[PDB]
Amino acid sequence: AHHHHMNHDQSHALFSRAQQLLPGGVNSPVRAFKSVGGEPFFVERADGAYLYDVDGNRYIDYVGSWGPMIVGHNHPAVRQAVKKAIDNGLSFGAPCAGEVTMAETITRLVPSCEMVRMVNSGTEATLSAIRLARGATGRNRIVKFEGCYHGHGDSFLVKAMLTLGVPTSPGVPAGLSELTLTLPYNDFEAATALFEQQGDDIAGLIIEPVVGNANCIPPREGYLQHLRALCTKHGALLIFDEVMTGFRVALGGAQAHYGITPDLTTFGKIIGGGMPVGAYGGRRELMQQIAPAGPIYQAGTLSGNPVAMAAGLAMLELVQQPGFHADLAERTARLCAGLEAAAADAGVAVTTTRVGAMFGLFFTSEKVETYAQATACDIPAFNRFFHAMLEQGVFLAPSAYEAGFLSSAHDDAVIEATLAAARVAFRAAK
Amino acid sequence: AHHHHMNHDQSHALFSRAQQLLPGGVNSPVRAFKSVGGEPFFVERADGAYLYDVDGNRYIDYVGSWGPMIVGHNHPAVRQAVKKAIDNGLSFGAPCAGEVTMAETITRLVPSCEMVRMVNSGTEATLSAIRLARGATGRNRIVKFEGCYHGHGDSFLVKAMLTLGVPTSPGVPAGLSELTLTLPYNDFEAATALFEQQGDDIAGLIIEPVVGNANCIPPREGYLQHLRALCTKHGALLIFDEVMTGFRVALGGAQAHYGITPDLTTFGKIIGGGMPVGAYGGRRELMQQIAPAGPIYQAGTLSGNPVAMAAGLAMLELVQQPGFHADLAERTARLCAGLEAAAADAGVAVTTTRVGAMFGLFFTSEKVETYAQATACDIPAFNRFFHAMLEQGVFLAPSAYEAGFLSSAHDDAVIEATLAAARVAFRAAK
Numbered sequence: 036a037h038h039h040h041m042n043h044d045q046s047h048a049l050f051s052r053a054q055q056l057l058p059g060g061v062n063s064p065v066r067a068f069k070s071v072g073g074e075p076f077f078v079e080r081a082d083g084a085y086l087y088d089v090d091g092n093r094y095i096d097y098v099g100s101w102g103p104m105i106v107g108h109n110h111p112a113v114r115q116a117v118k119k120a121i122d123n124g125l126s127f128g129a130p131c132a133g134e135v136t137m138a139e140t141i142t143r144l145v146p147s148c149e150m151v152r153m154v155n156s157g158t159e160a161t162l163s164a165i166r167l168a169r170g171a172t173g174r175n176r177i178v179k180f181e182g183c184y185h186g187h188g189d190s191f192l193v194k195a196m197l198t199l200g201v202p203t204s205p206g207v208p209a210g211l212s213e214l215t216l217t218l219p220y221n222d223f224e225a226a227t228a229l230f231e232q233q234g235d236d237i238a239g240l241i242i243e244p245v246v247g248n249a250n251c252i253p254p255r256e257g258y259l260q261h262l263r264a265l266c267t268k269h270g271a272l273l274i275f276d277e278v279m280t281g282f283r284v285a286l287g288g289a290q291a292h293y294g295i296t297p298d299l300t301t302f303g304k305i306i307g308g309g310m311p312v313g314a315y316g317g318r319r320e321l322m323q324q325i326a327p328a329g330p331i332y333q334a335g336t337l338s339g340n341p342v343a344m345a346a347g348l349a350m351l352e353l354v355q356q357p358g359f360h361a362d363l364a365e366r367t368a369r370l371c372a373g374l375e376a377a378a379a380d381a382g383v384a385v386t387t388t389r390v391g392a393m394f395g396l397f398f399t400s401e402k403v404e405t406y407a408q409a410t411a412c413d414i415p416a417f418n419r420f421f422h423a424m425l426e427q428g429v430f431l432a433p434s435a436y437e438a439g440f441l442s443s444a445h446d447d448a449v450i451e452a453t454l455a456a457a458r459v460a461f462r463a464a465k
Numbered sequence: 466a467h468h469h470h471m472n473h474d475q476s477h478a479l480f481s482r483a484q485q486l487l488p489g490g491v492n493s494p495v496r497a498f499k500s501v502g503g504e505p506f507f508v509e510r511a512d513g514a515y516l517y518d519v520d521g522n523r524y525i526d527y528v529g530s531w532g533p534m535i536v537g538h539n540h541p542a543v544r545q546a547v548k549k550a551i552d553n554g555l556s557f558g559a560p561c562a563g564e565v566t567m568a569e570t571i572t573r574l575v576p577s578c579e580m581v582r583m584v585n586s587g588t589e590a591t592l593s594a595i596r597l598a599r600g601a602t603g604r605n606r607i608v609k610f611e612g613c614y615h616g617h618g619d620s621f622l623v624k625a626m627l628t629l630g631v632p633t634s635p636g637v638p639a640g641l642s643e644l645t646l647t648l649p650y651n652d653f654e655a656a657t658a659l660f661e662q663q664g665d666d667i668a669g670l671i672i673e674p675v676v677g678n679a680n681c682i683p684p685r686e687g688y689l690q691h692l693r694a695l696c697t698k699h700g701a702l703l704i705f706d707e708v709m710t711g712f713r714v715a716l717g718g719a720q721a722h723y724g725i726t727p728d729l730t731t732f733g734k735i736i737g738g739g740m741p742v743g744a745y746g747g748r749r750e751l752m753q754q755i756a757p758a759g760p761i762y763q764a765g766t767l768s769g770n771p772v773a774m775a776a777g778l779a780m781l782e783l784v785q786q787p788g789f790h791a792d793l794a795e796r797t798a799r800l801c802a803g804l805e806a807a808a809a810d811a812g813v814a815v816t817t818t819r820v821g822a823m824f825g826l827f828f829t830s831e832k833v834e835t836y837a838q839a840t841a842c843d844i845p846a847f848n849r850f851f852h853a854m855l856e857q858g859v860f861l862a863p864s865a866y867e868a869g870f871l872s873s874a875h876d877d878a879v880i881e882a883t884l885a886a887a888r889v890a891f892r893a894a895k
């Protein structure tokens with residue numbers, strides 16, 4: 036780091052300027068560190084397992100740009116593919132071959148998708164998917180789950196006789212909010228009751244098949260199968276939001292891992308290799324409702340752009356190498372076990388969850404299966420642990436409500452260094 | 466081209482595969498060529514004034530990837546900036562200095578913006594801006610104009626006692642559609658009447674200050690001033706959608722060119738240098754309603770990403786060079802005059818419009834000021850002209866309802882070659 040005497044002078048100067056120019060000094064709320072306290076650091080560059088801030092501090096990174104960097108940051112094969120594409124021009128406004136190869140790859144790896152449509156973010160993917168579900172079924176109501184996050188389309192900015200939704204943000208019309216119904220994740224009986232009451236009127240049910248936006252909460256055995264059965268029984272479309280789980284929980288996503296066939300899936304993150312890229316897909320007959328094949332309108336001027344296709348295709352090639360996910364799932368297990376041991380040694384109660392290359396650390400003695408258990412955790416203790424880990428050179432997600440991520444750049448020495456850091460940081464946070 | 470005996474064999478093979486994998490074979494509807502007939506070509510690369518298709522055919526390009534390429538395709542300064550950024554990693558998930566520099570640049574060049582927020586598309590920018598207008602005013606109704614296009618947020622997918630909106634797409638809830646009111650562009654009296662009837666309930670009025678999505682239709686003298694006066698009188702926010710006009714009509718946008726101060730502006734296209742990038746901005750007090758500074762929620766995982774910031778900043782530097790827009794405005798005038806002369810020589814009635822580096826060609830004898838005049842044009846004659854121009858090696862927007870674009874790569878010989886092409890193509894299309 037620039038100072039020898041965790042100096043954050045350069046980040047502080049940038050953040051002070053940013054606060055005058057961007058709401059909260061950031062372009063996405065979580066970046067402002069308001070959940071953990073303090074000020075964020077500004078990043079100079081990222082490479083392998085590491086972030087390097089503008090003050091010269093290096094952090095082992097378990098955020099991975101929020102999921103895309105499953106092969107680590109700045110992977111040379113992804114960088115080479117991107118550099119090659121840049122020489123052809125950054126955007127065309129017309130089709131390119133990379134869009135066909137991308138569609139071939141997603142549909143082959145996630146066969147519930149016979150057809151896909153690229154967009155520019157997870158927000159665009161999910162707002163398109165629910166419009167497709169409404170337009171294909173002729174119904175208005177959408178079911179989502181408390182603790183899941185799908186982006187900021189207005190129909191998602193809603194909370195719970197008929198349990199009509201109410202907005203969670205100003206600027207979201209009340210009438211529209213009534214059409215979004217919210218269930219508790221992992222609650223079999225609540226899902227059954229809602230479909231018994233109004234299943235005929237539900238266009239679609241959207242879920243993170245493994246929750247990542249209330250920390251990492253895996254589904255109970257049979258739970259996703261239960262939701263699939265309710266949707267099929269009642270004529271609603273099952274929408275898996277695999278923006279985070281896709282290509283990360285398993286090569287074929289959470290739907291492969293748990294053996295579910297959704298009607299629609301949304302994708303993002305890994306499929307863009309680090310660049311802005313979303314997608315939605317499903318059976319051909321359903322997807323042919325989308326313009327210009329059918330009447331349901333959705334468009335995007337920069338969608339399918341060639342640099343993003345090249346970056347995502349390079350990452351998708353890497354994740355298809357034999358044993359990729361088994362390796363990362365073991366590394367994730369190793370990290371979680373080491374965190375539990377480090378916390379036990381310090382006398383701090385924690386538990387962990389994990390599915391493939393995503394994990395959750397929880398400040399509790401309970402095995403977390405529900406949003407209520409995630410929120411009953413010792414949030415101030417997490418906040419102290421986060422800052423103590425930063426001081427040890429490890430960047431965890433700055434929130435008790437965000438899953439963490441392993442990458443193939445987290446080699447044995449990186450994992451061990453993370454555990455050495457946790458051994459001290461749990462004692463700091465006790 | 467690969468064949469010596471406009472072969473499109475390679476595009477045809479790609480398009481046939483794409484039709485099985487993407488709705489309509491495309492990731493954005495206009496790309497399917499359904500308005501003009503025939504099949505689109507697939508692009509191999511883009512450079513300067515030219516697109517090169519996968520069959521080896523070169524086209525002088527007046528689409529410019531729909532607006533971003535105001536300095537031409539593959540500009541070496543933009544490419545250098547992007548390559549430098551790629552070496553630092555493609556995405557961080559945390560703030561970078563480029564986001565601060567981008568905000569400084571937009572707010573300096575477009576001073577109605579004291580604060581901005583980056584997003585990933587024009588669709589995200591405008592759906593955020595209308596949520597901000599609703600949340601800041603406590604009102605529900607949004608006014609838009611027939612022929613303007615803002616992206617596919619559900620509140621925009623609407624058509625016209627109280628003139629309650631109705632959806633234009635399945636999947637868009639009827640209740641929500643009633644909150645969007647539609648006026649005719651350039652109609653002073655209709656705007657006055659709507660505010661007299663329900664101005665107290667209008668949160669925001671959004672407009673392309675120069676229409677580009679019904680071909681290029683400039684505002685009548687005083688029209689934008691009239692809308693500004695109505696909004697201020699009634700407490701509604703004036704939202705300029707400058708996704709297309711920003712940095713293109715003038716350095717300071719259409720709002721500088723016509724001397725208007727909107728309450729909110731949306732940006733895109735040029736500000737990303739070819740990469741997926743949108744923004745919205747306005748006065749600080751208003752923008753501080755946006756999370757995490759205020760309660761109005763909007764987020765984006767990949768927003769402000771460093772490669773996109775570097776590409777956009779490189780383009781914004783180029784467009785600040787002395788005389789940039791005056792030069793392109795003259796080139797645009799020269800092209801339009803040459804098109805009029807080529808058409809007159811062929812006995813075909815056309816007129817043109819232009820503002821800065823955007824223009825419209827119309828198959829009519831009328832000076833187009835209204836959507837009704839744009840739609841009264843000879844659309845089949847345009848379609849014949851489009852295909853004849855393709856055959857002459859010129860790619861115009863494949864729609865009678867899209868503005869065209871000049872770039873600094875359209876040198877004198879490029880413009881002259883375009884006119885030589887038009888001299889034959891107007892005769893083909895007569």
Ligand SMILES: Cc1ncc(COP(=O)(O)O)c(C=O)c1O
Nearest residue numbers: 156157158185186278279765766
């Ligand atoms: C599962 C999931 N879906 C959707 C989103 C929204 O995606 P974006 O921020 O790219 O709009 C996120 C996180 O932001 C997510 O984790």
Ligand SMILES: Cc1ncc(COP(=O)(O)O)c(C=O)c1O
Nearest residue numbers: 335336586587588615616708709
């Ligand atoms: C003025 C304007 N605003 C918004 C949009 C939508 O932007 P995007 O396709 O990036 O979502 C477009 C065109 O698509 C546009 O021309």
